[PDB]
């Protein structure tokens, strides 16, 4: 349960006092929370060109402590909104805000927002570590792996503002090897990281299909819209065109369909009749007949919602002697088969999917560092705790333990911080 108190003397972070004059379009910010009897009200967003943003003190996630010297900790959403609306135009409001409590963080991520966050202090310390004779990598790793992705963007902004140099460029020149790969990956936003991992996977027609498949099969609609937008910004070409240029056959049709990020959203009602019909269609399209009707498989597995397809795959076992994964291995081959196997795993149990990919990257000789690094970077704020839970349950030892055996040095220490702990 999120922390809550009605006493200001028990709040965690730092306090900001603001004075805003009401404009024609209000004070220019939105708030969330205050429905549960014990829930903070926090700043959801700030209207640009509005009083709150132009003042410069208010920030997203801040807890509203008091309004016009009345403490509003514990007050309902409706009571506080009424206070702001009753203020006439030109009158002012006095706000005390508390900065340190986060908003909208995943419950299953391993990397949490640092509470006493000071972007300027972090940039200063990173610069000192970069300029140290024989780079101080420990400080660089200790900081960046203990900050959320959003905070790393603030660190990079404060670093560029002080030194007039990009933080990623300075770290690229100071770090090397697998440690450099991890740190530079942490510095990108989730969409920037996936977009550049996708571009790298399509270096030629001899494509690292594993990486393309892994990203496109495991990303959600929301994540794929931002990837498609950011990919075109960074590389001035649509992601779909590069997939079309880099794939062929039914494998191409499947990757293009998934990358659109237009999967049907999770419905409120379970459609039991469509569940049975989809299961029969998957059976009729494959195991039941000679050959395979691949477009029917692509259509059902790319367009239906994930909760729907989980029940479809269970109902499919009623008609077919083999489950969906085994049916795929019997019906198709090559990149098409690998893509269907990854997609079905992502639908059925995405944390287990990443746990198996982590095991494969380390089990044998050496390491598939590219796979291991990308997963530890991209899932550390999504579902890393479920990935660790599935890993320890299946393999007996923790993901932490396997990372220790396969990697060494500051590289290992960074991966262990992204892991989050032993199991």
């Amino acid at each position: 349960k999120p922390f809550f108190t009605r006493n200001p003397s028990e709040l965690k972070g730092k306090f900001i006092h603001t004075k805003l004059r009401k404009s024609s379009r209000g004070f220019g910010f939105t708030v969330v929370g205050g429905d549960e009897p014990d829930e903070f009200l926090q700043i959801k967003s700030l209207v640009l060109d509005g009083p709150a943003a132009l003042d410069g003190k208010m920030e997203t996630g801040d807890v509203i402590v008091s309004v016009n010297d009345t403490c509003v900790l514990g007050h309902t959403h409706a009571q506080v909104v009424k206070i702001f609306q009753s203020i006439p135009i030109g009158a002012s409001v006095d706000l005390e805000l508390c900065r340190g409590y986060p908003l909208g963080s995943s419950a299953y991520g391993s990397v949490k927002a640092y509470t006493n966050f000071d972007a300027e202090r972090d940039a200063l310390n990173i610069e000192t570590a970069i300029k140290t004779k024989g780079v101080d990598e420990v400080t660089i790793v200790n900081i960046l792996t203990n900050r959320s992705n959003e905070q790393r963007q603030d660190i990079a902004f404060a670093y560029q503002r002080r030194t007039k140099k990009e933080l990623a460029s300075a770290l690229k020149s100071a770090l090397s090897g697998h440690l450099e790969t991890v740190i530079l990956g942490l510095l990108k936003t989730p969409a920037q990281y996936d977009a550049s991992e996708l571009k790298a996977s399509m270096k030629g027609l001899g494509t690292d299909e594993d990486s393309l498949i892994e990203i496109i099969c495991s990303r959600t609609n929301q994540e794929l819209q931002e990837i498609n937008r950011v990919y075109k910004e960074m590389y001035k070409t649509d992601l779909e065109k590069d997939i079309i240029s880099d794939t062929s056959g039914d494998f191409r049709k499947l990757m293009v369909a998934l990358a659109k990020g237009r999967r049907a959203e999770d419905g409120s009602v379970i459609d039991y009749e469509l569940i049975d019909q989809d299961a029969r269609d998957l059976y009729d399209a494959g195991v039941k007949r000679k050959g395979t009707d691949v477009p029917k498989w692509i259509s059902i597995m790319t367009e239906r919602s994930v909760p729907h397809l989980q029940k479809v795959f269970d109902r499919y076992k009623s008609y077919s002697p083999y489950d969906m994964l085994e049916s795929i291995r019997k019906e198709v081959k090559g990149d098409l088969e690998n893509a269907f196997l990854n997609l079905v795993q992502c639908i059925q149990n995405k944390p287990l999917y990443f746990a198996d990919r982590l095991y494969d990257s380390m089990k044998g000789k050496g390491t598939r560092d590219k796979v291991l690094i990308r997963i530890m970077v991209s899932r550390s704020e999504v579902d890393m705790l479920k990935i660790r839970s599935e890993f320890k349950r299946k393999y007996g030892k923790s993901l932490y333990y396997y990372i220790q055996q396969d990697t060494k040095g500051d590289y290992q220490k960074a991966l262990l911080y992204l892991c989050g702990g032993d199991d």
Partner: peptide, 4 residues
């Protein structure tokens, strides 16, 4: 979620 309410605008102010």
């Amino acid at each position: 979620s309410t605008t102010l």
